[PDB]
C-alpha cells in the first residue's frame, strides 16, 4: 500500500550512502537490509578503512578517491560521529619488485598528488617501528587516511532517516519482479514497489543476481583482521604511525596504527578463504592462517606491535575476475542499477558510489566517469 521512488536492496556501505544522498533531494526512499546496519555479518565492519588517493589500479578511480575525500570531510560536519582521522597511508615494497608500489607513484605523479619518496633506512628513520629492508622503497600520502566505516554506515543512516528514508532491518529480499515501468521485491516481511532499484548486497550479490536473470562471476573471500598489542610509543597515531598498505614477496598487508591506546590492527589483503556468505565461519582463529599470516609479517616489518592478540575480525571481500567494481544499469532493465563486486578495496569510494548510484537511479546517467566498471565489459566473464 506505500509505492516508493526508490527501493535500495542491502542498505550496507554502498547501500546507505545512496540512501543519503537520495533522501537528501527529497526522494521517497525505501532502504531494506538482512540485518540492522552496521552490522559484523558484511563488509564493513572492523571499526577502520583506509583511505589512499593514488590510486594505481586505473585513472577512473583517482577522481572517484578525491571526491569521495570531500564527501567524507563534508559527512564529518554533518554527524556527530567520528568519521575521519589524517593519518596519511604509506606504501612500501622491495624496489623494483613491486607492481602496486611503482603503479601508486606512477599515479601520484600523474594526478599532481602531495607525496613523500623515502627508501631504505629512511623508512625506518621516520617512523620508528617499521623495519624494512634498505632495498625497500616507500611513497607516503600525508593527507590521506582513515575511515570508521561503522561511524560512516550510521551516520548516513541517521541523516538519510531524520529526511524521511525509511529502513526496514533484519528482512532478506528473497526476490524481485521488474517491469518496464516499475521494480518489485518479495521478502518474509512482504512485498515492495518503486519506480527504481538500486541492488547493492555485497557478498550476497553472488548468490541473489541470479534471481535477476544476472550471471557475474563473484566469489566472496573470508578476510580477517587482528588487533594486537602494540608498542604506544610507536604505534599511536598520536605519534603519527601511519596507516599502511604494502607489498612483500608473500603477499599485501594493510593496517591502522593504534587510535587511544587501542592497538595496531592489521590484515592481509592477498588471502582469504573462499566462502559462502551464509556458511562462513565468523570466529577469529579458527584457522591457523588467521593469526600466524599476520605475526608472520609483524615480527618482520613492525616488530613492537608483535604482542597479544586482543581481538580479531572476519570480514568479506566479493571478487570479480578483474578486480575492478560493477556499477552500472542492469542490462536489461534501465530501472535497475547494481552495485557489487567490490573487490576489497571499495569502502573508501562509498560516499561517492552513492553519489554515482543516486544519479544512476534518477536519471540513468551519472556525472562520474565509470567505464572501467562497466556491467558488460568482457573482462568480467
Ligand atoms: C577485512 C576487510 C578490510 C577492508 N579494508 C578496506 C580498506 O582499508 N579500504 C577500502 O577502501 N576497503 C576496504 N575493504 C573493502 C570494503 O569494506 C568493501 O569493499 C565494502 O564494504 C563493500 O561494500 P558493500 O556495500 O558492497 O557491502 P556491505 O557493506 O557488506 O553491504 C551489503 C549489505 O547487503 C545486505 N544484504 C545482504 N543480503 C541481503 C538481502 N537478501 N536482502 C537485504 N539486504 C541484504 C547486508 O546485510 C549488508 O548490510 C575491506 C574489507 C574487508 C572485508
Ligand atoms: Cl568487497
Known amino acids: ?7 535500495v536492496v542491502g ?25 540492522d546496519p552496521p552490522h559484523t555479518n558484511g563488509s564493513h565492519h572492523g571499526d577502520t578503512r583506509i583511505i589512499r588517493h593514488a590510486y594505481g589500479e586505473g585513472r577512473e578511480y583517482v577522481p572517484l578517491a578525491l571526491r569521495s575525500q570531500e564527501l567524507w570531510y563534508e559527512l564529518e560536519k554533518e554527524t556527530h560521529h567520528k568519521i575521519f582521522t589524517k593519518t596519511g597511508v604509506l606504501v612500501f615494497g622491495p624496489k623494483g619488485e613491486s607492481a602496486f608500489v611503482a603503479e601508486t607513484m606512477e599515479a601520484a605523479k600523474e594526478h599532481s598528488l602531495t607525496v613523500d619518496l623515502l627508501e631504505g633506512d629512511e623508512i625506518n628513520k621516520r617512523w620508528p617501528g617499521i623495519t624494512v629492508p634498505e632495498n625497500y622503497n616507500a611513497i607516503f600520502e ?53 519506480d527504481k532499484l538500486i541492488v547493492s548486497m555485497g557478498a550476497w550479490n553472488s548468490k541473489l543476481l541470479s534471481k535477476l536473470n544476472l550471471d557475474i562471476p563473484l566469489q566472496p573471500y573470508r578476510q580477517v583482521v587482528g588487533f594486537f598489542e602494540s608498542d604506544e610509543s610507536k604505534y599511536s597515531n598520536d605519534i603519527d604511525f601511519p596507516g599502511f598498505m604494502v607489498e612483500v614477496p608473500n603477499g599485501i598487508y594493510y593496517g591502522f596504527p593504534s587510535f587511544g591506546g587501542c592497538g595496531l590492527r592489521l590484515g592481509y589483503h ?79 569510494f562509498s560516499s561517492g558510489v552513492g553519489e554515482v548510484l543516486s544519479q544512476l537511479a534518477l536519471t540513468g546517467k551519472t556525472e562520474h566517469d565509470i567505464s572501467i566498471f562497466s556491467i558488460n565489459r568482457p573482462a568480467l566473464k
Open 142 to 194: 600525508p593527507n590521506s587516511g582513515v575511515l570508521f566505516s561503522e561511524n560512516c554506515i550510521r551516520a548516513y543512516r541517521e541523516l538519510a532517516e531524520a529526511r524521511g528514508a525509511k529502513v526496514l532491518t533484519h528482512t532478506r529480499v528473497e526476490d524481485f519482479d521488474i517491469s518496464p515501468d516499475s521494480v518489485k521485491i518479495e521478502t518474509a516481511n512482504g512485498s515492495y514497489t518503486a
Open 270 to 348: 592477498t588471502f582469504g578463504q573462499k566462502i559462502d556468505p551464509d556458511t562462513i565461519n565468523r570466529e577469529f582463529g579458527v584457522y591457523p592462517e588467521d593469526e600466524s599470516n599476520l605475526r608472520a609479517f609483524l615480527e618482520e616489518y613492525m616488530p613492537g606491535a608483535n604482542g597479544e592478540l586482543k581481538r580479531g575480525a572476519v570480514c568479506m571481500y566479493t571478487k570479480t575476475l578483474d578486480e575492478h567494481f560493477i556499477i552500472d544499469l542492469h542490462p536489461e532493465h534501465s530501472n535497475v542499477v547494481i552495485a557489487a563486486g567490490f573487490s576489497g578495496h571499495g569502502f573508501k
Open 11 to 35: 542498505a550496507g556501505s554502498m547501500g546507505m550512502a545512496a540512501g543519503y544522498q537520495l533522501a537528501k533531494q527529497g526522494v521517497k526512499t525505501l532502504l531494506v537490509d538482512a540485518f
Open 1 to 7: 500500500s506505500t509505492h516508493f521512488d526508490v527501493i
